[PDB]
Amino acid sequence: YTMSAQVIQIGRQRFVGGLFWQSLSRRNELRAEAVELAKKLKFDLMVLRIDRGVAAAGYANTRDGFAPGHLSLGAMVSRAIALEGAFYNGRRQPAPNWLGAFALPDGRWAYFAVRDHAFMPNGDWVGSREEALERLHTDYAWGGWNVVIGEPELERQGFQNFQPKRLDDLLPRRGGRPRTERWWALRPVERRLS
Ligand SMILES: [K+]
Ligand SMILES: [K+]
Ligand SMILES: [K+]
Ligand SMILES: [K+]
Ligand SMILES: [K+]
């Protein structure tokens, strides 16, 4: 019972970071494949991230402090960036390869790393500002990134292509009111009886 997950309260919405991300084959019904992989990888909770650019599952375990109904912060940010792209190499365009770090309302930071529109396996992390920046710089060294998207203060880091962005800018809304999309929610991975 590691209980490493701590909910992120953003207004009325309860988000989580730290899912394990698994790209799917695209050869089988995506949900059924995701369920099979969850059993093998030993996770009892999942979210599906599906659109024209991605077919992936984000996984967690109840024993690690995650729960059905927790909203995937990664799912939200991933889709938001899929929708708006980013400015890099002289134009606003889709950004398949992006990294970012965002300040959270309680002082923690979220770190994201996405390649070919899909999260890297551990590219969804929440913790201290210092460790988030450390992870950011570490993945950045690999190269092949379109853009760094995140907290405006990261301007100062001197990344080649930087896109300032706050989580608040990305949340979908009803006028001023944040909307929750149901698909962000972790749901139980159904298992047959033995
Ligand atoms: K994976
Ligand atoms: K796979
Ligand atoms: K494949
Ligand atoms: K997440
Ligand atoms: K995406």
Numbering used by the authors: -1 to 192
Q: Which sentences from the paper describe this structure?
A:
We here-report work carried out on PilO2Bp, a component of the Tfpb R64 thin pilus variant assembly machinery from B. pseudomallei. We show that N-PilO2Bp consists of two α/β sub-domains separated by a prominent central cleft, typical of actin-like ATPases. The function of PilO2 within the Tfpb assembly machinery is not documented, however, PilO2 is reported to be an assembly protein that localizes in the cytoplasm in the absence of other Pil proteins, translocating to the OM in their presence. FFPred, from the PSIPRED website, predicted the most plausible topology, with a cytoplasmic localization for the N-terminal domain (1-194), a transmembrane domain (195-214), and a periplasmic localization for the C-terminal domain (215-432).
Moreover, we report the 1.55 Å crystal structure of the N-terminal domain of PilO2Bp (residues 1-192; N-PilO2Bp), solved by S-SAD phasing, providing a first glimpse of the 3D structural properties of the PF06864 family, previously lacking a structure representative. Thus, considering the availability of 1.5 Å resolution data for this protein, the single-wavelength anomalous diffraction (SAD) phasing method was adopted based on the four intrinsic sulphur atoms present in native N-PliO2Bp. Four sulphur and one phosphor anomalous scatterers were located during the phasing procedure. The N-PilO2Bp 3D structure was then refined using data at 1.55 Å resolution, to R-free and R-factor values of 0.186 and 0.223, respectively (for further information see Materials and Methods). The first ‘dimeric’ interface, results from the interaction of two N-PilO2Bp molecules via a phosphate ion. Indeed, the identified phosphate ion is located in a pocket in the C-terminal region, interacting with Arg61, Arg189 and Asp42. In the crystal, the phosphate ion further interacts with Arg50 and Arg77 of a symmetry-related molecule. Considering the location of the expected transmembrane segment that follows N-PilO2Bp C-terminal residues, such positively charged surface may help the protein interact with a phosphate from IM phospholipid head groups. The second crystal packing dimer is built around an ‘anchor loop’ that covers residues 168-179. This loop was refined with higher than average B-factors, suggesting conformational flexibility that may mediate PilO2Bp interaction/recognition with other assembly machinery partners.
